[PDB]
Design a protein around this ligand. Structure first.
Ligand SMILES: CC(=O)N[C@@H]1[C@H](O[C@H]2[C@@H](O)[C@@H](C)O[C@H](O[C@H]3[C@H](O)[C@H](NC(C)=O)[C@H](O)O[C@@H]3C(=O)O)[C@@H]2NC(C)=O)OC(C(=O)O)=C[C@@H]1O
Ligand SMILES: CC(=O)N[C@@H]1[C@H](O[C@H]2[C@@H](O)[C@@H](C)O[C@H](O[C@H]3[C@H](O)[C@H](NC(C)=O)[C@H](O)O[C@@H]3C(=O)O)[C@@H]2NC(C)=O)OC(C(=O)O)=C[C@@H]1O
Ligand SMILES: CC(=O)N[C@@H]1[C@H](O[C@H]2[C@@H](O)[C@@H](C)O[C@H](O[C@H]3[C@H](O)[C@H](NC(C)=O)[C@H](O)O[C@@H]3C(=O)O)[C@@H]2NC(C)=O)OC(C(=O)O)=C[C@@H]1O
Ligand SMILES: [Cl-]
Ligand SMILES: [Cl-]
Ligand SMILES: [Cl-]
Ligand SMILES: [Cl-]
Ligand code: NA
Lengths: 603, 603, 603
């Protein structure tokens, strides 16, 4: 008579039935005769096996020595101070699933297609999450074999074997290629609060969420783990909530606070992460369905590595991704069509702020950042790229505005792109560089703003479309940089440039018997890659009345009348020399101005 | 003795009283004798009628055939997999309320006033949410009768009949006009998780939240619904949480994933939505209190329509709204003072990326977007506006930076504004266009960067304040666009322009007996609307020693001395022709440079 | 037999044990014999003293007359409509703790160091939150004694007495200085919903959260409180969730909606706040550990003050902070390295939009804002700074793009920096101003774009590095501003400027017997600080065939041949005067063009 089943709630259900509406870990611990001090792996596995859809957990530290694999929807409601101690062997892994349903049966055109045919659409319906995936190694990028092409789509309609999807294709895919079509069954794994402990030797990421869509995470915190703290893998449309994901293990091939692995449409609106290596690593792995990362937006994040790599990262399978209003030591720039904007970027100890080491092609945008440097920037420039493989598309570096701080040096560079000597063939595609927007630099010395060249001078020409360096500011009067450094590739026939205009005035005084009156040669603060265009004009001094023919003639009745023909008497990459050529030799010394303007505008 | 009321908790309350602290749907189902497989409409209505303030729901799919109207605060705590199936007839509608309390009694000045008098302030206190609303059709915009002016305010203080409000008025409102003052009693309708199913024929939006303030939504997901998936209506200060709101119905007048209806101070920080038509529609309807939308900020969202409209939208009652770091197919630009920045914008099949179809006035800012095009852009330009009604204020298109991708064509345009032939009267206000910031375009052909003209050439002049096209890049050597296309309106007397400077060098060699030495005519890559300003100078070749009088004279003792007077011998919209005029005919051929610069700077 | 302890759940725990898994306020009220209508202070204190880690609260208004001090982790789960009425005396204060563990033992270099030695690292481990703090008054800024230097760090590793930390130092700290090292034990204080009422006389902030890290707040709302609605103090890595924090009290020294006090790494992604004074105040106080604020990012917020101060604020202990896509009446700009971008900024009644009143040094970035003005801007410029103390570093104002609206006036200024007469010594560091990006201004009159000067003209020179005003637009034909206003400091020897180029054309007609043919003097729309560089060229009219020697010669066999030597005949700050000097006096009148270009480019 003393059972909860014998007690009647006013509704007519029993007290047992009231109790059954809420699942608690403690009832399971009692029933399974597992103490809260013992490994609870079998208990967590039993709760999920029982199909419990929401589990409340009392605040304790619990041993969890197993890898707990959630494959159905599950929600934790954990009290603060609930900690799962995975030791050397445990972890949580929450995953949806895929199946290969068909193959591609029409060609997909990058940035254009919104539909494709399949061999079999019988298992496809509107709203499905499909994966287009090429199983061929290097099919996205030549840098790593597992950089394979693909993307996630949501089905808009099916008509026969024609699948219309929302949006536009991010890549080209051919019928003739090994293109498989997967269908995803996503998981909805939820938690208000999840806090974990692992040793630095535990090879399991404390939490992985895999094949999930349309979600915002709860609070997550880890201590330990060998490789990464939190991984979001093959996820689609999600926001990362503020967290304490970290890695503090001895250096290995990963060491990531958060790893965003093969995800699409991923924001991180504010937070901080610290790691032995990358704090946020954007990349992934090489299993079936591990698509390139794209449409990433990280904002307001403070991201640091303890070793001399970058806090913020983009691997070579990452495109269409931005860090905005973030702080990082160093930065990696991914495949292309990526951006760092409004960021505070600290130079690495090994020189340079931004590295392009796995370039595929597209734009590399550096918009209104603040850069903090201290090295001479002689071995690595502020922004440095090394092309070791053929590009898929033309590469453009676009540095628009911002503030470059430091001392610089006689050999410092702002943007340098080199072809590796290991790429022993001419580069098919082109490089462009665009530096603009009133970016300032307080270096005491700077060798160049932009340079692009092969790794062996005179081996190959690196094709260049255009280089624009049109609106930059060196704040120090000792700085004397090239706008564009001259060498074979930057001087090749078809290269077009815009190089910042300069202008000035110089007072000259003619002397008796002059047939020319020449300013001294003018050494330009900013040097061009080649002799610039030069305009020279002559005019009166401020504070003097308007010239008439009496200024240069002793008697205006005497003809020919003397006039000052303005010319540029000498031009070099680094020099102009305004002068006057007289039509009759000077009799009376006169003081007046010569004006000049230099520039290059070829595209 | 077997009642929960007979069992004593250690606190001294009964077990029934413990149970009563938490409301569950299952107790209601039992007590009301409604099976969980039956329509639960009467149960939900009874729970809310009972004043339950927080309801826990067990994961099942529940039939809900009625429209459930929440008019008091209510909170759901739903297990994952809780689904409300509305079928053809059901939905949820959560609403606050309004009353008309008074009328406006002083004139309000746009961007200036922070107070207004009323006829009766007896029902107003500090902190109240008031609505200023004009009941007269077309009082905000001439495009649709229900585009009526008004705004939401919060009261800062009341002194007699003077209401001081926080902020500054967004519009002008006159005593003499039909201006009513409403007071809002907001609802606080909450959910952790809400997932719904409706047929595509169900005319109810699955969830509407109306007259709520100061909130962040929980997770929401719908399948089905005829018109829209989620509507936020007459809401004030809110953030939209990530969701799966959608529409997939046959095309009708709406088909919106999320509709933001008549809202003020509305962010959406990351997400994705797909719809038959607009994914996010910003607009609303025409009931009392349906103010213009303003102060919208959507960030990090991927927004697509299946039909050839736009994923991202702004209707003609929308101002002060931005999409930033979003992706969309096509784009609508609302009333004015709106922006798309840092967006990926795909061209519609029907040509063009951005449409201004209900313009009221103000700025239309396109900042650092990437545009993906494939059509010839001959019928609709990249950015295209049609003025069919008088503007309320001058209209400015400001395209600052970015990357324009595609092939273009011989008739392609970047920015075109036309007056409709249906507006058979001269336009009162002005149009301005400002294209700057180093925006690039890789078209093989382009007709113009900017053009503004009436729909019948020579009918009316469209007034233009200024057109600036000062810093653009056509990357292809085949492109030969007008900066500003010349026609009646762009050439009218009072129009002021800035048109990008060009410059170059040409080597010339004089011939024996020349009295002039003329470069061949130079055809400019970028064409002006009218003959540009031209500067010509003469100078030495690189690699040659500084000129003296011996360069152009066989014997410098013989006077007059020959000098090279530099001139521009011919000017056209598209041509310059530097030359030298000699003061005595040439005896010795000489090779030297002529330099030129063109530009227009009128404002 | 009627105890919950006598009833057995199916798990084997008693019904009392089931009940004990959830804490409710109502059980405490019963057991403590406190009615829900009485002061519940003793009940809240007992719940927290009992170590309850999660408390559920039924919706009622509860009297709380005490200041409830949470010093251990605590979580509320409050029903909507739960209100804590603090009256005149109550409040909530949730705090972590600190201890001074050691002192600094090596010098730290701003923007460079990532490690420091301590006197004792025995209490330090990896992951610890440490505070570096200088106890000396004015050690961050000279404006207020409690502006002391320091920062928060997280430990990466400890080796002996060497502490490596994540990131890079934000300031310099010397061994020799009074630099203490604190260790923080943070609190995790959580709530879903917290709504409070206080009188306007209650000196307690309704909620303070102090010494917490890695969190996102829940929903918070207050009515009342004398000084501020919500304070986040000495917090590290957090996001502020949307809220209704406010202040409506009579003006005092604070009156803040939200006060961010001495915090680091703080985002606010969307919201609205209203206050008597600042809506969001960023600053803090002067206790041990009250570091400068840094790494703030507020986005999508509508922020207003009722009095004529600013809605958005940054005090003089704030650096590295941005408001983006926000709306405010007026704005304060903090210490430096701060930004307002993409904001709508309303002019205060007392003139001006943006105030720099406690400058320390660094950049003050105003990027793409829209400014709404109505005063003549004669007493305070749009952007105005007053230097009353020595700067720590050079100060740069960088106004890049945007839209300046209003009438202006004959004395209006855009950027003005003045040295106070109260600073009766020469300023050590420099001021720079950079105005660019195509910023527009629709004023009918404007005196200057940029001016920097001492408070007594001719007393001291304010050192200026550079002033650039290179790309601005006055849309009105009546506006005639100086680019840079000329006075002692802006004209001093070492000052370098870039001042926007101008150019034009004028047709002239020679007359019989001319020895010169002079255009009338040209009055420049934009005036320079000093006589500009001037280029003059001569050329043919549009529509005329290419010039040859016949244009200026009646018989080309007669030598010398007449040629038109182009010159600038007069230059002033505000004037040019193109002319031709003839080598033989004119016989036949000719009509032709003179062209001119002006500019200054000195850095
Ligand atoms: C747990 C373990 O030890 N696994 C072995 C390891 O597996 C590798 C392999 O699957 C590659 C393709 O992915 C993972 O390592 C990447 C890593 O994700 C980073 N890449 C990107 C784009 O973010 C990093 O930069 O590169 C490594 C890498 O290429 O090794 C994965 N590692 C882990 C720890 O999960 O290696 C191999 C193997 O054959 O090389 C087999 C095991 O599964
Ligand atoms: C449920 C229904 O069928 N209602 C009928 C429909 O009502 C219209 C009407 O209230 C207008 C003013 O608003 C709604 O339609 C708008 C719609 O919100 C969009 N506008 C904006 C600015 O976002 C769209 O672009 O235009 C339509 C429109 O103008 O029709 C509302 N429709 C719905 C489905 O709620 O039409 C009428 C009627 O008299 O025209 C009456 C019914 O209430
Ligand atoms: C509750 C109270 O009345 N406290 C007295 C008050 O305390 C001041 C003092 O601690 C200063 C350093 O901080 C607080 O006032 C600041 C305030 O935070 C703002 N500053 C910034 C940078 O945000 C504001 O602009 O300035 C005031 C100020 O300097 O007074 C604090 N006030 C409060 C209400 O907490 O004053 C004194 C005192 O000796 O001056 C003692 C009391 O603790
Ligand atoms: Cl004169
Ligand atoms: Cl002569
Ligand atoms: Cl020489
Ligand atoms: Cl001709
Ligand atoms: Na710019």
């Amino acid at each position: 008579a003393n059972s909860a089943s014998a007690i009647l709630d006013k509704s007519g259900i029993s007290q047992q039935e009231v109790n059954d509406l809420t699942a608690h870990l403690d009832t399971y611990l009692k029933k399974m005769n597992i103490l809260p001090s013992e490994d609870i792996s079998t208990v967590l596995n039993q709760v999920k096996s029982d199909g419990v859809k929401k589990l409340h957990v009392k605040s304790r530290e619990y041993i969890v020595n197993s890898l707990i694999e959630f494959t159905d929807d599950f929600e934790f409601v954990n009290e603060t101070g609930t900690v799962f101690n995975f030791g050397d062997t445990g972890g949580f892994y929450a995953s949806g699933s895929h199946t290969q349903i068909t193959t591609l049966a029409s060609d997909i055109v990058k940035n254009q297609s919104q539909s494709f045919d399949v061999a079999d659409a019988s298992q496809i319906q509107k709203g499905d999450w499909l994966v287009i995936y090429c199983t061929d190694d290097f099919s996205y990028s030549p840098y790593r074999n597992y950089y394979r092409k693909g993307e996630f789509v949501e089905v808009a309609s099916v008509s026969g074997n024609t699948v219309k999807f929302f949006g536009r294709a991010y890549d080209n895919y051919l019928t003739s290629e090994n293109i498989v079509i997967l269908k995803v069954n996503p998981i909805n794994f939820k938690f208000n609060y999840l806090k974990t402990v692992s040793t630095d030797n535990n090879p399991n990421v404390p939490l992985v969420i895999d094949y999930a869509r349309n979600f915002e995470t709860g609070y997550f915190e880890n201590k330990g783990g060998k490789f990464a703290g939190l991984r979001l893998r093959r996820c689609f449309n999600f926001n990362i909530a503020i967290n304490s994901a970290k890695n503090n293990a001895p250096a290995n091939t990963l060491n990531y606070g958060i790893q965003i692995s093969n995800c699409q449409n991923y924001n991180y609106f504010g937070g901080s992460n610290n790691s032995t290596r990358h704090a946020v690593a954007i990349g992934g792995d090489g299993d079936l369905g591990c698509v390139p990362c794209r449409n990433g937006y990280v904002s307001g994040a403070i991201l640091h590595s303890e070793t001399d790599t970058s806090g913020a990262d983009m691997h070579g399978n990452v495109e269409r991704t931005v860090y905005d209003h973030c702080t990082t030591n160093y930065a990696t720039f991914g495949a292309g069509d990526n951006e760092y904007s409004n960021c505070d970027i600290y130079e690495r100890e090994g020189q340079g702020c931004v590295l392009i080491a796995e370039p595929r092609g597209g734009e590399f945008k550096l918009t209104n950042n603040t850069y903090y440097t201290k090295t001479p920037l002689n071995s690595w420039s502020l922004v440095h790229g090394i092309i070791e493989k053929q590009l898929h598309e033309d590469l453009t570096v676009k540095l628009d505005g911002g503030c470059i701080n430091g001392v610089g040096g006689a050999s410092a560079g702002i943007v340098t792109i080199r072809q590796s000597n290991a790429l022993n063939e001419a580069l098919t595609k082109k490089v462009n560089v665009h530096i603009t927007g009133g970016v300032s630099c307080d270096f005491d010395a700077l060798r160049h703003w932009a340079w692009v060249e092969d790794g062996t001078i005179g081996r190959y020409t690196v094709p260049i479309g255009y280089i624009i360096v049109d609106d930059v500011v060196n704040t120090k009067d000792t700085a004397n940089p090239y706008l564009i450094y001259p060498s074979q590739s930057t001087l090749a026939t078809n290269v077009k440039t815009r190089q910042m205009l300069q202008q000035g005035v110089v007072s000259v005084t003619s002397a008796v018997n002059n047939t020319a009156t020449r300013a001294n040669v003018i050494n330009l603060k900013y040097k061009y890659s080649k002799a610039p265009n030069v305009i020279v004009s002559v005019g009166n001094l401020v504070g003097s009345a308007s010239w008439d023919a009496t200024f240069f003639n002793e008697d205006t009745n005497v003809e020919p009348l003397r006039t000052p023909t303005p010319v540029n008497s000498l031009v070099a990459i680094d020099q102009v020399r305004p002068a006057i050529l007289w039509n009759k030799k000077v009799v009376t010394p006169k003081t007046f101005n010569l004006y000049w303007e230099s520039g290059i505008r070829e595209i």
